């Protein structure tokens, strides 16, 4: 993440520290989207009702 | 004994300008140019609008 304002010229420039991030089960999820949608496409199977 | 009669003060030439600032425009400065003698003059605007 960098953070850049308009500067004494044309532009200034700050940037901050590299940061490294992974996306796996272990990481809790929100969702937020819930369920009830037909035809599912997983891991799992494929099931239809 | 010689001398010589004050000249009046004349508008030569006349401009307003304004400085470039990074962020915007800066505030318009109107440079004028004069010849004459005066101790004191007052300049006065009327807008042509």
Redesign the interface.
């Known amino acids: 993440v960098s953070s850049i304002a308009?500067?004494?010229?044309?532009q200034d420039i700050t940037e901050s520290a590299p940061a490294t991030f992974i996306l796996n089960e272990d990481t809790p999820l929100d969702n937020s989207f819930v369920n009830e949608t037909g035809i599912d496409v997983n891991y799992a199977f494929i099931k239809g009702s | 004994t010689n001398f010589r009669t004050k000249e009046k003060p004349i508008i030569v030439a006349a401009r307003s300008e304004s400085e470039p600032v990074d962020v915007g425009v800066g505030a318009p400065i109107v440079v004028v140019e004069t010849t004459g003698e005066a101790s004191y003059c007052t300049i006065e605007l009327k807008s042509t609008a």
């Open positions: 308009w500067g004494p010229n044309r």
